[PDB]
Amino acid sequence: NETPRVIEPVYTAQWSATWIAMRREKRDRTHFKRMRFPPFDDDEPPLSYEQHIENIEPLDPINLPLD
């Protein structure tokens, strides 16, 4: 239901930061593992959000470290 709205300049800033972060990552990493597609096999069902995901903590997002 929620509409995904953002302060435009702020939004740009965020994307800019991710643009530079991403670019940095590209720079540094010798190889860059991509995701295999599709992610799951036809036998593997849509795993439950509660049973698998809701317990485990997510990795750190992309954002260049700011002074």
């Binding site: 010798t30 190889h31 593992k33 991509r34 295999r36």
Partner: peptide
């Protein structure tokens, strides 16, 4: 040289594979 550019794995030491061995050697 297409399949070289596609190569999901390219230009690497087995830093991720050594971590798998480390996880299983444990």
């Amino acid at each position: 040289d297409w399949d070289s550019r596609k190569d999901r794995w390219y230009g690497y030491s087995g830093k991720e594979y050594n971590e798998l061995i480390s996880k299983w050697e444990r």
